[PDB]
Amino acid sequence: PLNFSRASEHRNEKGERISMINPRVVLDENGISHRSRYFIMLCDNETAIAHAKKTSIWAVKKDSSKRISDAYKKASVYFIFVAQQTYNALGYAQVVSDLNSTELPFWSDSSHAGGVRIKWIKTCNLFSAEISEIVSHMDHGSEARDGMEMMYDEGSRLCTLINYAIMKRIGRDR
RNA sequence: UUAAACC
């Protein structure tokens, strides 16, 4: 079972922090991998998520746009989509363009900085108690804030849990 | 709906 209480204590022989799931993955002092970075999208709008599952365009919020665009410079960047009120996992996707003002989804509003293209990896409408728990403690033990970056081990565990449910025919949406 | 990466 994953426990972050001692995550800072997982270290290699050089003193670098390493992942609790895969000890070969070197992390910064925030638990983030320079190679693979994960952001949560807390979805409150059925129209937006259904349109994004069809068209693969997402609107990024002003408050998280700079950090996401900076992460896209040298890492693979993933968005994990979670329904805000129920914490159902809706899927996860890789960001395959940077922020731009040329291609916006029609549902974007003044909260959004611009658009990105995504490539869906899995889609679902899934309840999992461990996904719920990870989202509920993502901000230092308190609930995730929309657009926040999470730790490598949180992103990787969420992808594993989504994949596992889909392969068991649980929470599929297609 | 075969995560990616690392091995």
Numbering used by the authors: 315 to 488
Original authors' sentences:
We were not successful in crystallizing the USR–YTH construct itself, but removal of an additional 19 residues from the N terminus allowed us to crystallize Mmi1 residues 301–488 bound to a 7-mer DSR RNA (UUAAACC). We determined its X-ray crystal structure to 1.4 Å resolution and built an atomic model for residues 315–488 and all seven nucleotides. The core YTH domain of our structure of Mmi1-RNA is similar to apo-Mmi1 and to previously reported structures with a central five-stranded β-sheet surrounded by four α-helices. Part of the N-terminal USR region of the polypeptide, which was line broadened in NMR spectra (making structural analysis of this region impossible by NMR), was ordered in the crystal structure and folds back to contact the back of the YTH domain. This results in a network of hydrophobic interactions involving residues Leu-316, Phe-318, and His-324 of the USR, Met-334 and Ile-335 from the N-clamp, and Met-465 and Arg-471 from the YTH domain. In summary, our structure shows that part of the low-complexity USR of Mmi1 (residues 315–326) lacks secondary structure elements but adopts a defined fold on RNA binding, forming contacts with the YTH domain. DSR RNA was bound in a pseudo-helical conformation in a groove generated by the central β-sheet and the C-terminal α-helix using both positively-charged and hydrophobic surfaces. Residues N- and C-terminal to the annotated YTH domain contact the 3′ and 5′ ends of the UNAAAC motif, respectively. Examination of relative B-factors from our crystal structures suggests that the final C-terminal helix is relatively rigid when bound to RNA. Residues 301–311 of the USR are not visible in our crystal structure, and signals from most of this region are line broadened in NMR experiments.
Mmi1 is an essential RNA-binding protein in the fission yeast Schizosaccharomyces pombe that eliminates meiotic transcripts during normal vegetative growth. A C-terminal YTH RNA-binding domain in Mmi1 recognizes UNAAAC motifs (where N is any ribonucleotide) that are present in multiple copies within DSRs. Surprisingly, Mmi1 binds DSR RNA using a divergent mechanism on a surface that is distinct from the m6A-binding pocket, including extended protein sequences located upstream and downstream of the YTH domain. We propose that the low-complexity region influences RNA binding indirectly by reducing dynamic motions of the RNA-binding groove and stabilizing a conformation of the YTH domain that binds to RNA with high affinity.
